[PDB]
């Protein structure tokens, strides 16, 4: 956006006013850091102003900190490491610039995911995101890049067979019937309404080159060109998390090898693992989650503390069902994260059964993991 | 946004999909025109993709056509004239590339604005917008440019005296009391919610360097760095449109001469008149309006046709009050536009008085102006 033209202004005159802001970007940005990085750019011309814009536009709420910045590029994380590195270290529990992310795509290293109590575990899912090397990320990508990402993705997905045979639904030419089926399948996405996403520029040209793919069994779902180039979900009613995770891993490997053959592998490096637009999703990008009925445990005074010790977190959803998933993303592997979900949920179901009988769970509260 | 990087893609691969669109941009853009202009840029790096983005994002509704493009720059209108010229010609009643806009800032050339019936005319207002030469327009301007626009504007406004003595209210440091006073004064603006405005990038860094100035008499109002660099309104209860227009003109002249002395005159040329972000506002940028009670005439079968013949238009607002203003912007002067409002409203009040008595108005229906 006229970077050499903006660089005619003094850094002070361009420096954002972040006095009311509560996000990770505003905590780290200083006048000196802005001055040092304002003249840099990635090979695709992504700038510091572009990385920080959503954090400038969205000061947020004192209760919760947002990240407040995006990568437009693989090399955004390097060119602007003096911004991203302290953000990453704060957001991801001390993960340092010299630390290494371990990736583990072997679902057989999972131990015991198959027997989660279906009276309590209503469903099991594992999701992640992926970027495709050679293309810039949604905040920045051109219509041509986004179209090339779609074409590669659909051709890969159309070639899968067996359990992974499926069909692609472009948002632009979706019929009302096809839309309505995807809504009550819970497979549809639409244009983001989040001001954090909109202010980053990722919703441009909507719905061009966005779409939905899913397999015939409706157990493996891919979203194309939404928040990241790809978002991949494996899901199942019940509690066979091991089977969900196998299908997740095998399905991703099949897409990965097609993309590698085309010279466009999944974006990855040994420091950050899989890179994606939002720094909070780095590493595994993985949210492995259950829906669990915790009628009694959710009322226990230590419910929040138990979740912390198990390194899990909850969001919203018969009766008092909770959407529980791993909190970690960077500095621990896909297997370790799903293992934490498996072990943690198994314990919390045991806790719930105890409270059903009026028995204390305090001896069951684990030490911090 | 990486223009040379986007220019590595073929023009076909970057060409927007506008098949579902109903805006002036989509009517004019062709593959050949996109290919010819995609590699151009203004001195501030504004590109064709930037001019058209809001029209790509907002296909709109079949009933009403939107413009679907913005200028980021004074020279956007020249660099991309092969896009803007046919849009302007369609939007502004045949106004050709070689035509000249006449500007007339002498309120004394108005004839007879003082005696509009106050039993029917509840209020009178004249608004316009202005851009400041040397700074890019809100879709594109940097925080430093926007801050410089504010500083120049406030210093000019703070120096006015007499009828035009006033005070500036920055949005960022506004107290609740100051806000609440401006709301029930009807002087406040906030962050735009229009997807047409948001998709153009003009709401970046909100509320930085936005604010409100008004005189002590609450009859002259200036908005800084909202849709355009300046939006200026003169208003009054009642029907002394001549006095509103005098105050409007004199207040603008006082701001104009300060800005000229600083080497930053109002942006203007002989072809387009005052230039602004939206092509529909070129020429005068002027919306001169009344609120009028037309209890009987608004029900007459020819109400819409009478408005057309008078070159006026209505929007929404005791009983059945209509917000009536001039439809023209480009190819006619400020005086001619307010004159059309004065003469047209006077006729429609006379029509209303006739219908109050059960008398026909057909002999009063004017020929097309």
């Amino acid at each position: 956006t006229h970077n050499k033209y903006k660089l005619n202004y003094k850094s002070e005159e361009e420096y954002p006013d972040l006095s009311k802001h509560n996000n990770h970007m505003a905590k780290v940005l200083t006048p000196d850091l802005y001055k040092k990085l304002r003249d840099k750019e990635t090979p695709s011309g992504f700038t510091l102003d572009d990385v920080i814009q959503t954090g400038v536009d969205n000061p947020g709420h004192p209760f919760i900190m947002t990240v407040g910045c995006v990568a437009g590029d693989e090399e955004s994380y390097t060119v602007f490491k003096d911004l991203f590195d302290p953000i990453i270290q704060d957001r991801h529990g001390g993960f340092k610039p010299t630390d290494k992310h371990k990736t583990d795509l072997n679902h057989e290293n999972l131990k015991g995911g198959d027997d989660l109590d279906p009276h309590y575990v209503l469903s099991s899912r594992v999701r992640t995101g992926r970027s495709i090397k050679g293309y810039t990320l949604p905040p920045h990508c051109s219509r041509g890049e986004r179209r090339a990402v779609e074409k590669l993705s659909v051709e890969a997905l159309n070639s899968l067979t067996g359990e992974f045979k499926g069909k692609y639904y472009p948002l632009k030419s979706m019929t009302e019937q096809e839309q309505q089926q995807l809504i009550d399948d819970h497979f549809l996405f639409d244009k983001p309404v989040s001001p954090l996403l909109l202010a980053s520029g990722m919703a441009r040209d909507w719905p061009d080159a966005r779409g939905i793919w899913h397999n015939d069994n409706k157990s493996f779902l891919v979203w194309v060109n939404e928040e990241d180039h790809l978002r991949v979900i494996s899901m199942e009613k019940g509690g066979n998390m091991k089977e969900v995770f196998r299908r997740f891993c095998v399905g991703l490997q099949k897409i990965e090898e097609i993309f590698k053959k085309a010279g466009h592998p999944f974006m990855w490096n040994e420091h950050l693992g899989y890179v994606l637009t939002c720094p909070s999703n780095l590493g595994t990008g993985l949210r492995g989650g259950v829906h669990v009925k915790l009628a009694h445990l959710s009322k226990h005074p230590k419910f929040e503390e138990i979740l912390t010790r198990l390194r899990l977190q909850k969001r919203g959803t018969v009766g008092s069902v909770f959407d529980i998933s791993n909190a970690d993303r960077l500095g621990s592997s896909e297997v370790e994260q799903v293992q934490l979900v498996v072990d943690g949920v198994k314990l919390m179901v045991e806790m719930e059964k105890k409270l059903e009988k009026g028995q204390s769970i305090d001896d069951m509260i684990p030490a911090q993991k």
Side-chain angles (χ1 to χ4, degrees), chain A residues 46 50 70-73 136-141 200-204 227 277:
Chain A
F46 207 72
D50 302 315
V70 298
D73 262 348
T136 65
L137 309 172
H140 195 54
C141 63
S200 82
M202 64 65 90
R204 290 167 295 102
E227 274 191 39
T277 305

Side-chain angles (χ1 to χ4, degrees), chain A residues 41-47 50 72-76 136-137 140 145:
Chain A
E41 73 186 14
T42 67
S44 82
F46 207 72
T47 69
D50 302 315
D73 262 348
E74 194 161 14
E75 31 286 281
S76 284
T136 65
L137 309 172
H140 195 54
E145 280 185 295

Side-chain angles (χ1 to χ4, degrees), chain A residues 91 110 116 121 125 241 286-292 294 297 302-315 322-329 332-351 366-369:
Chain A
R91 173 68 185 70
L110 185 69
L116 294 188
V121 180
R125 52 213 38 183
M241 179 58 89
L286 186 142
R287 189 198 170 294
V290 301
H291 288 250
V292 277
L294 300 173
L297 183 67
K302 303 230 190 133
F303 184 46
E304 299 287 347
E305 196 193 279
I306 290 163
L307 260 16
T308 299
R309 290 160 173 272
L310 296 171
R311 305 186 78 77
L312 306 174
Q313 56 192 1
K314 78 194 200 307
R315 43 211 76 192
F322 290 80
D323 186 354
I324 302 298
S325 61
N326 60 296
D328 296 314
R329 296 289 184 284
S332 65
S333 79
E334 289 84 353
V335 166
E336 293 175 314
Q337 282 163 14
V338 175
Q339 193 67 74
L340 278 166
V341 173
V342 166
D343 299 348
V345 173
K346 273 202 294 200
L347 183 64
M348 294 205 294
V349 166
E350 283 159 24
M351 289 186 177
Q368 180 61 67
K369 294 179 174 184

Side-chain angles (χ1 to χ4, degrees), chain A residues 128-364:
Chain A
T128 192
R130 289 289 184 275
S131 303
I132 292 149
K133 197 173 170 64
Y135 302 102
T136 65
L137 309 172
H140 195 54
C141 63
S142 80
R143 281 184 294 272
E145 280 185 295
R146 198 189 292 112
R147 285 169 183 166
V149 167
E150 183 192 41
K151 177 180 163 63
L152 180 63
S153 298
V154 175
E155 276 166 1
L157 295 162
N158 282 347
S159 83
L160 307 185
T161 72
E163 187 178 27
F164 298 100
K165 182 65 171 49
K167 177 165 129 156
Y168 180 69
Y169 296 87
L171 293 202
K172 72 192 317 152
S173 61
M174 209 168 48
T175 84
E176 174 66 286
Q177 169 275 105
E178 292 175 326
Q179 169 156 307
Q180 194 59 237
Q181 186 55 53
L182 292 164
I183 289 195
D184 41 58
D185 277 341
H186 304 312
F187 288 179
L188 196 79
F189 66 92
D190 42 63
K191 192 173 172 165
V193 289
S194 172
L196 315 181
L197 296 176
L198 294 167
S200 82
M202 64 65 90
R204 290 167 295 102
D205 317 299
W206 201 274
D208 197 299
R210 275 70 166 207
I212 295 139
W213 181 96
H214 71 77
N215 62 346
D216 294 346
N217 296 339
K218 301 201 196 186
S219 59
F220 195 72
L221 174 63
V222 180
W223 288 358
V224 181
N225 288 322
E226 193 232 22
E227 274 191 39
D228 279 304
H229 289 155
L230 295 180
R231 302 185 68 181
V232 173
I233 303 118
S234 183
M235 75 284 268
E236 217 163 88
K237 289 300 183 208
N240 193 346
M241 179 58 89
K242 190 178 89 179
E243 174 60 18
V244 176
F245 190 51
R246 176 207 72 73
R247 186 168 50 251
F248 177 79
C249 285
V250 171
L252 273 166
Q253 192 279 331
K254 286 185 182 306
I255 300 162
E256 184 196 7
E257 54 175 3
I258 298 176
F259 280 16
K260 197 190 154 183
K261 267 206 217 163
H264 295 283
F266 289 161
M267 285 197 11
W268 183 95
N269 72 60
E270 60 178 354
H271 172 47
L272 300 180
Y274 291 106
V275 3
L276 300 163
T277 305
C278 202
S280 68
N281 297 330
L282 295 169
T284 62
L286 186 142
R287 189 198 170 294
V290 301
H291 288 250
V292 277
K293 303 214 289 333
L294 300 173
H296 300 312
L297 183 67
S298 62
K299 274 91 132 168
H300 191 295
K302 303 230 190 133
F303 184 46
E304 299 287 347
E305 196 193 279
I306 290 163
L307 260 16
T308 299
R309 290 160 173 272
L310 296 171
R311 305 186 78 77
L312 306 174
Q313 56 192 1
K314 78 194 200 307
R315 43 211 76 192
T317 295
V318 299
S320 65
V321 185
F322 290 80
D323 186 354
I324 302 298
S325 61
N326 60 296
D328 296 314
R329 296 289 184 284
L330 183 62
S332 65
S333 79
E334 289 84 353
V335 166
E336 293 175 314
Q337 282 163 14
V338 175
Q339 193 67 74
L340 278 166
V341 173
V342 166
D343 299 348
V345 173
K346 273 202 294 200
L347 183 64
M348 294 205 294
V349 166
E350 283 159 24
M351 289 186 177
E352 185 65 24
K353 282 165 175 162
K354 287 265 209 101
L355 295 166
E356 283 171 7
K357 306 206 276 234
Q359 310 185 357
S360 181
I361 61 179
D362 295 7
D363 49 340
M364 311 189 71

